[model samples]
Target: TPPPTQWSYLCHPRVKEVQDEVDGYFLENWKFPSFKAVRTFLDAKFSEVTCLYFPLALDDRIHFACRLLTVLFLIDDVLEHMSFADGEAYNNRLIPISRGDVLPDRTKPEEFILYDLWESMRAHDAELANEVLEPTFVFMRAQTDRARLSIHELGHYLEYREKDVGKALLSALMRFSMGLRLSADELQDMKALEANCAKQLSVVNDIYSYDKEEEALCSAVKVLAEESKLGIPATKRVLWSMTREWETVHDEIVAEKIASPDGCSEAAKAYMKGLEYQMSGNEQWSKTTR
Candidate 1:
């Protein structure tokens, strides 16, 4: 009956600084020019990952955010070709780093880049390493699991991506940026909001990227098309509807958090702010990035 609560958009003032730092970090550390090209491409697209998600994050927090995005995009590219077994092995290797293990010597570019990201996470918030940071591996591992499902089942494709991607890393970065930590019970309560953020972001991304990735079997558009038994044009219409639904869900979640009887914790409030920023900010960045 009433309009859903609305959130505003504002990029981090230091977006350019973070972008330049990320670019320099990749350019200096990477051995090949081709790898640098990948950096350039990601920089152009998701360079605002940090800026959009944590508009107020600064100093080492911002730097750490950039490093996290760099490692995620780069390793995601590497894992695209890998089998589940190999991807799991890579996840296992990185899990220790996420849990505060020292960076190991390795020839692989992904490993080296992950080591750097791990260092930034460790330096940014050692306290959250086990609780918040290490959990990101679970999401990375889920990508491999989704690939396995994609082999046998079509229905599980959208479901897996909806469950496994986006929010895990964003939540981890939010904690790192805001210096917040929630107990297991608190996090359990927050799962709905997490899914809302993931769904909203994935939909936003899929809407923009579907055209470029249409031939790819796993694009959200394709999954919805197959699941709904619709043509591309009709699927586009469904995606439009789903996007509005998720955005409404996001607003409702925010309103609920704000109106909680216990009056949301400071950290919870900060987390909500970050989520709100991502809701509007992600859509804006997606349009401008490419």
Candidate 2:
């Protein structure tokens, strides 16, 4: 598979084409300036309720409001990326669903929209699983720190996904909690993890986005090229950050599957193995990138 940097708009050779495609995608389906639309739609109605700002945005007053909106945005990205990456993997794997799948039940109503796609994908075709599910799963795992990432970015939207002014400044404090499979019971634990992840990702995003952030646009980028070597150091920075956070909420998140009292050693170990896999991407990235 291509390194994420290769295919991502950040380093793609076909930047213009990809940009046009993405623009078209948003323009046709999402309409232009979707994120800004989110801002406008949500702000107009609930501006008072959603007091979101970065650096100065972390208060109880807007936590839930931000979280609610963040979750909504995540669903969109997850679904978008899931299909986007799925197409790339078409050569190897065949997923049950794709952009085609979202058609039949287009009228199923909004709340169940995503969940419906998920169920449909699982039930529709099996061959697509290799291409579709595998890539998405890999995508999820590759973005091991995504829980915190998605949450943090979601927070950014809360502040200013549109204006792009002082955006990164405020976003530096908001961390995306990994919500791949977060159950309601796990929210408390994830919250702790989000805080820890934010601190760590902030450091990394600072390193990567340093030059960009420093430029005084929204955030900085570059300059940390040496410090942000895309290997273990980078991954460990993130992993250790999340691990420490997870430790705090281990009981709830892991459900003591790590414990022997459950009489399900295999299940518990399997669960840990999964967590470690996402964490392992740092090593994988190190091997390929560094």
Candidate 3:
């Protein structure tokens, strides 16, 4: 069972088409061995997961968002296994590829495939591509950083989890998903919502994915639960209360916008709408998928 979310669930109508397109790309272009076989990993339903974030994505936009999700999953699977020494080496090569400055040899799927997708992303949105690059790099390092971080404080743990979560990367891609470009002010409004929204999103995932994630011990809940005599079931309620604390900001903003529509930028309105669908859609998809 999943915790309650005020956000509505609406997965993309074309999820099948989007998913097939994504898997076909990987089948043809992922030059490496099977990801699950190589990493001993569970299939996370990368394609369906992308549908959760960009539920409104249509036609070509489907694969754009899905492709980004797919590669992040691949890089994440590959990087988590690498030691910090080797991690830096991979990051060095990866950065230049993301910049579209180098053409990696095709045999190394991780390098060449990412190089290919980065080109597509930039092809679609050059400045947006340029903007997302920093977050992508920081996100890559967060994989290695996870090993280095031993989060003891709940606040530190939440901050660490949010940093590693890749919300920033997807936030930009959400704009690309709909071709909605925000002004500086709109991005700021969305940024404020995102800060709190991200916290709630993590809590939502933590609570629902607890059974699957219990052994991983990377979730925020384990920190709060372990200290008390109260175990996980009770601790989930604790997480729910925490979720509401952050959830209020999103509700407040959306409510205000409802009261007065023109006062809010359409770009910002769509941005938050995408986020609302994201939170709910993620939970919906999470239950059905790995």
Highest lDDT scorer: 3
Q: TM-score ranking from best to worst?
A: 3, 1, 2
Q: Worst 10-residue stretch by lDDT in candidate 3? A: 36-45
Clashes of each: 0, 31, 0
For model 2, how does the per-residue alpha-carbon lDDT over 47-117 read when each residue is reduced to its tens digit? 22122121122232123223333323444344545554553443122122333333333432322333344
Residue 30, model 1, lDDT: 57
Q: Ranking under lDDT, best-scoring first?
A: 3, 1, 2
Best by TM-score: 3
TM-score of model 3 (CA atoms):
0.86
**lDDT score for residue 10 of model 3:** 81
lDDT of 3: 0.74
Give a tens-digit lDDT track for model 1, residues 1-290. Answer: 11233556788888887787887777666555476676566556455766777786755577777777766766676677798889888888877755546566667666667776776666656776444564567667766765243422334544565575456777777677767777676678888887767767776777678777745355677777776789977877777677777777877787887898877777777776777787778777766666
- For each candidate, the alpha-carbon lDDT, in order, equals 0.69, 0.32, 0.74
TM-score of 1: 0.80
Q: TM-score, each model?
A: 0.80, 0.27, 0.86
